Amino acid sequence: TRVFKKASPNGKLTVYLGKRDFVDHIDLVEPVDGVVLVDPEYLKERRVYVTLTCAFRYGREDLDVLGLTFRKDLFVANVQSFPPAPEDKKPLTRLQERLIKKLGEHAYPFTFEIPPNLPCSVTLQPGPEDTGKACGVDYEVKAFCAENLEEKIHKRNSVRLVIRKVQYAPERPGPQPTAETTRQFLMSDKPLHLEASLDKEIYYHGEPISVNVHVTNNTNKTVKKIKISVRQYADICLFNTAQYKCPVAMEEADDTVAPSSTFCKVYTLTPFLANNREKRGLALDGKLKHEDTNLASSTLLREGANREILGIIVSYKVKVKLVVSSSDVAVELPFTLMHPKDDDIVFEDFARQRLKGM
16 A cells, blocks of 8 residues: 655654545545554653644635735644544544554554545636635644643644545436527527537536537528536635636537527536636636646535635536527536545655646
């Protein structure tokens, strides 16, 4: 198996994790299980704590930065790690029992269980024009040395790292999302009927989207061309609320539909951050420089749910449009964008792999 790790500036403390992206379903959220490597001597009476903060920040580009103009803590979890507190004691994963047995006795566990209905790691990076500042919700894991809880944490023997809460939806049976509209122009009751659908409700980053477009033209006009698009919507709803709208995929085609005939076709779009990187105002599931970053996924929420508490609400839509030689006739279908997903361990850094940038 493979596990990531990171050490404190003075290598006296070292965190060990088997993932840096925790997959949350709806029922449950993969548990955040890791262990610390301590130097009992180095810290006399001092202790080892590990905390999981979940918060929304606005202004800077991360929680640890001291230039953000707003912050709301959405979750916090502290655990007395070194001095094993019989109180704060749990069952233990296997990657743990495994790890502890390779690190020794100075190996100590900790485990965090993230409530199912908390927002997922989402970051919205403002453009050049946009008057808003960056913001997002991040999960910070911090293990540190101190006697009491409160003493002053020092960047010296403390370690910090951002993990990720990614959303996965299993794809159900349901009907394909449909949308239709009829249009009658000036001086005639002859209609132009549009109707589209997507092959399914749930998609995953990188997974293609198929659009079945059917056009019934009883009109005496002509459909010049057809434009298919996939837009993203981001509603920052906390410090300084605003709504960002951004296209993540377009596919215009010179398809023609003659007077009194029926048209039919299947288009394929692929929303990919790669072909949008140089864009801004959109929401991502991380920072741009990181390679393992995608487009922010659809914010889920159902019945009596607090919307502000989620930070940034994200949604997607596919728009179909016919340019008729005017007023185009169009429809739109909403979809959900989700996330995919005798050993030997072998530690590896925690830092997220980078891009290519000049």
